[PDB]
Amino acid sequence: PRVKGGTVTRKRRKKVLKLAKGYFGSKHTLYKVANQQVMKSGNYAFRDRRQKKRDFRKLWITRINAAARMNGLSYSRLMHGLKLSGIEVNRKMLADLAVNDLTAFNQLADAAKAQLN
Amino acid sequence: MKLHELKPSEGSRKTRNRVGRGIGSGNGKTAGKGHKGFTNINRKEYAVVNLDKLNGFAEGTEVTPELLLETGVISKLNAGVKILGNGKLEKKLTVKANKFSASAKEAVEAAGGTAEVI
RNA sequence: UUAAGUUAGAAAGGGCGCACGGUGGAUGCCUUGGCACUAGGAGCCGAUGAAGGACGGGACGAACACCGAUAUGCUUCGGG
RNA sequence: GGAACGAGGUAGAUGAAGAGGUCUGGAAAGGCCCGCCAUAGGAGGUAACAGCCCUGUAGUCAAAACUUCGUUCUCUCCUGAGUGGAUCCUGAGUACGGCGGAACAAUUCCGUCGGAAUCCGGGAGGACCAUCUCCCAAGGCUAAAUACUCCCUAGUGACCGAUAGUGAACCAGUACCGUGAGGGAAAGGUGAAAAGCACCCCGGAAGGGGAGUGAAAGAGAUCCUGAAACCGUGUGCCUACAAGUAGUCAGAGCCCGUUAACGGGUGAUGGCGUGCCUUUUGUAGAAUGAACCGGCGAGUUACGAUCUCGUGCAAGGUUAAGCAGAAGAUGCGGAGCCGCAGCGAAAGCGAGUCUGAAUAGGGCGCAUGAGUACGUGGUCGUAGACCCGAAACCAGGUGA
RNA sequence: GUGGGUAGGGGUGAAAUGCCAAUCGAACCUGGAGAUAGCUGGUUCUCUCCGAAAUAGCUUUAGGGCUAGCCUCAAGGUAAG
RNA sequence: UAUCCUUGGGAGUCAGACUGCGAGUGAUAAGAUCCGUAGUCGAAAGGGAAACAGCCCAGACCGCCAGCUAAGGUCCCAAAG
RNA sequence: AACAGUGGUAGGAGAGCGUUCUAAGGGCUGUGAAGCCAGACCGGAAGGACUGGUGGAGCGCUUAGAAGUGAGAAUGCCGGU
RNA sequence: ACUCGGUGAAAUUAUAGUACCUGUGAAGAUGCAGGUUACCCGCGACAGGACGGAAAGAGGUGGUUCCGCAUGGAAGGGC
């Protein structure tokens, strides 16, 4: 027997066009360009889910460097001292919080200073 | 077996492979084909009934070309029946074949049955 | 009041989302028409003018259908 | 050559049983609670899905007149079997031979010349020469079993359902194109019922707003449903120092409030980021294609070969055409097919057998049995053979 | 001006492209015919396992085809590599 | 250390590109010229060389706002002397 | 459970998702079917529900069977813009 | 041509918020890297780029007992 088919095509294209909501101009209207943009977005999302982990560490290092130079050390010397004291278990992220929310963390910088002698 | 619970025998039916219906099936664009790429006039041919066939040839006392075919032991009688020395036929029984072999002859004569030749 | 600094808001028009319409005939239901066969019929018509047509026929326009100056019908025999 | 009986065809007739109650509803054939008919539960219609509402269906009948068949009467016509075998017949330029082409010892066709026998007679069994075996040429006529359907009647589809199915569901071989032969479209849907909008108002009209009909008027004449491209009106957030395959990750502010979910919309700023397809050693390219949206658009079927899996039976396994039977299953039909042993060209023998003097060597084959009938799937071959797309050649015609 | 003639392996009478209905180095229409093409373009849902080659020898071989090399699936040998 | 042999089914592939070693080759340094020989791309994303098919490091089942390193780096762009 | 593994073009193998129809069983639906529109739901993918609107009469579930079986590219064909 | 009133096409077209320079790069960079410039939107001109189109170069001898035409002779045997 014969099979026509219109419903499956309409639904499958509408799903993509709904995923392309918010794009500029023709890229939320026409199926052919919306499909391309959705594929590009998938690739970008994967790549940037890796780059996010890359970037937050960079931010943390910058803030630690600033708060450490507020004490007479540099980032490298402070990290070496912290590791040399076993207290280094403390992260970079948690360190950075204890730099915008409790600069009384200088205690840690004092410990690193004591160990660096 | 009810008409709403029909089950095939496991492994008897395989789904046909439909080629050219998307790149996710492995057979997409190129569809699995990849890129561009001395006789005689008449011969007498006797049938064969080895001694092993006659081994336990209970069938009939007289092993006639008929019985042979009638019972079924021999099928197409073709040119004629020929007993061949292969097997250890062991029972009191007469025989009637068109041609014999040396071993078949000595076996039937050591058995004790008749070995007449058409 | 002066000086030096910070910010806000602005829409001629435009972008995204939403609400509401227009145009256009996909889609879904449907069938007046097709397609492939089966079982029987029947396998020719014509000089006593065929097949196929032209022109005409209605109370009142054109066309289809039906009919032929006896022209939208005549006679008979049946059915109803 | 007619005449009587029977069955058909070409009109038709008759034909059982529910307004059951009740609910929703515009409408009941639907739901729930009850009954009936059935040789009739095929089908269509009716305001929604009907056996009992209508037309009908099963079963019974029915023909003045034309026809199609049978049966009988009538009608018409009509000898066979023997004994012999004295004597005649049994199919004339034929049977056969040459001569050329044709066809192609050659083979036949046709012509081109010839040219027997004839019962004690001839012709055949690849040639000729003999044995035997079958037949009787040179005159004519014959139904049935088979082939196909432009048509008519009754039906049937794991056939299409308006870009499909006929080119044509609609005034289709039409409209159009061509001098002509010829080529050849598009185009279905109000509503159950026109009940198809009296009347009032704006307007020259078209078209609207009320009123009215209707279940629905956003069902009002290309009048079921009505998607996308495309075109607009209103509004929440952002936007006039900014350089971009337009997204993605981080992220304030503002506006909302969901299939309550580590919610939705928009996004000032920061990082990263050279479309899709085809092709190529290699593409972002100055390789190729696509204006956009929608529909349609490509590995099938038949017959062979082979391999795997499943089922049945197994040294055996299986029927074909036909007959009967709803276009069915099935029953019978065993002719035939494949396998159960090989070797040698053959000759013949045979778990061996050929070659070779070889019991030399060598080759093959037994030397531990599994095939067969169907079905699914993979691949190969022949058919237009996955789809689209040349230049050329031939046949019959139409055109100064 | 009007009415006519010559037709396609032909005409326009051998010597001329100037052509025969937008067609002419052979007109047009229908059929053989869904011709043939080793050339060109395309071949539509998803995930899992494994995963190449672009090297040698022939083909009147001509970017085409065949045999080796390299991939995958199944069954056996088994432990050889 | 787990591969490799046979049989059977199914294939794709037949202009490869660049880089480094040699020193087979102008055997020497070669360039050549091919010859070998290894790697990568083809079929491989990620980090480095500003950008960069073939160079260097290294082979992406998927999430995490966790840690240690490779090549390469630590004045600012831009993480770290 | 303990290890080990999971880049991939040609290509080989495996497991599935959807569409039309048919058969059997079970059902929906005028207190509103298919189709269309919207949404912040569910699954590893193809996909599947649930609510609201429009629509105004048919549709789907389980197990099998058969295919005119899934479209983004052919300077595709037809329509609309 | 230009402004105003009326009417109203076509080639082309992957989407596009589409600067310049120096490099890099499979052909020539708008879209790659680094830098330098630039408030938003139009109208009329130019012909620079226009990856616009035009162009155009360019042997005998010699073995066989195999079968044998229904039957024999008479013919003919794989190698």
Side-chain angles (χ1 to χ4, degrees):
Chain A
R2 196 187 177 236
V3 190
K4 266 174 193 140
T7 305
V8 303
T9 318
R10 177 176 290 120
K11 290 153 76 158
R12 182 187 44 87
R13 298 199 183 119
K14 273 183 75 73
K15 288 199 193 255
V16 177
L17 276 167
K18 149 87 179 149
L19 277 174
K21 193 178 296 301
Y23 297 176
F24 180 92
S26 298
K27 274 171 201 210
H28 73 268
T29 326
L30 319 178
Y31 167 76
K32 281 179 197 186
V33 297
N35 187 58
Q36 290 170 199
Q37 204 48 67
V38 170
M39 297 199 289
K40 270 272 206 183
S41 309
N43 264 340
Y44 286 157
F46 185 83
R47 177 206 63 177
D48 286 342
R49 271 194 307 269
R50 305 298 166 96
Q51 295 191 325
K52 184 210 320 167
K53 280 166 259 281
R54 272 184 231 176
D55 283 353
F56 264 90
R57 184 173 164 110
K58 167 180 180 139
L59 180 73
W60 297 325
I61 281 167
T62 290
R63 291 187 185 176
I64 289 176
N65 209 356
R69 296 198 188 258
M70 255 184 33
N71 273 280
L73 287 156
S74 62
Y75 172 80
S76 49
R77 308 252 297 146
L78 170 79
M79 293 317 290
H80 178 237
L82 275 174
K83 181 219 170 189
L84 275 66
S85 178
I87 61 171
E88 206 188 308
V89 175
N90 263 77
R91 222 161 30 209
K92 287 166 196 42
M93 180 171 174
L94 265 289
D96 184 1
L97 319 175
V99 175
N100 289 337
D101 309 322
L102 177 63
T103 299
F105 87 111
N106 293 335
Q107 293 177 335
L108 273 48
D110 297 332
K113 271 167 173 301
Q115 204 81 36
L116 280 155
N117 303 340
Chain B
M1 190 160 217
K2 294 174 181 304
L3 279 164
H4 41 283
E5 287 114 356
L6 298 174
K7 305 286 191 313
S9 193
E10 193 271 334
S12 49
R13 302 254 171 180
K14 269 182 72 157
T15 288
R16 179 213 300 262
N17 174 61
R18 301 164 36 233
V19 175
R21 296 277 191 284
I23 58 149
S25 67
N27 295 132
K29 177 175 105 224
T30 71
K33 301 297 175 291
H35 209 287
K36 302 174 182 178
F38 187 18
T39 59
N40 59 7
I41 296 97
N42 48 5
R43 182 183 186 278
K44 176 185 73 175
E45 197 277 327
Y46 284 161
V48 174
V49 199
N50 284 352
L51 301 193
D52 61 356
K53 298 183 71 68
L54 283 101
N55 207 351
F57 211 81
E59 306 238 315
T61 292
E62 293 177 350
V63 181
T64 59
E66 183 178 2
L67 295 174
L68 275 304
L69 160 67
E70 295 302 320
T71 54
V73 175
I74 191 66
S75 303
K76 175 190 294 306
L77 275 66
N78 216 58
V81 175
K82 185 203 269 182
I83 307 330
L84 274 76
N86 186 340
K88 293 179 179 179
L89 62 80
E90 183 178 2
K91 299 296 183 181
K92 293 179 179 179
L93 177 300
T94 52
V95 175
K96 194 39 161 144
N98 159 350
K99 194 168 274 189
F100 286 80
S101 202
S103 325
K105 267 176 71 83
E106 61 72 38
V108 60
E109 295 297 324
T114 70
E116 290 91 11
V117 167
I118 295 95

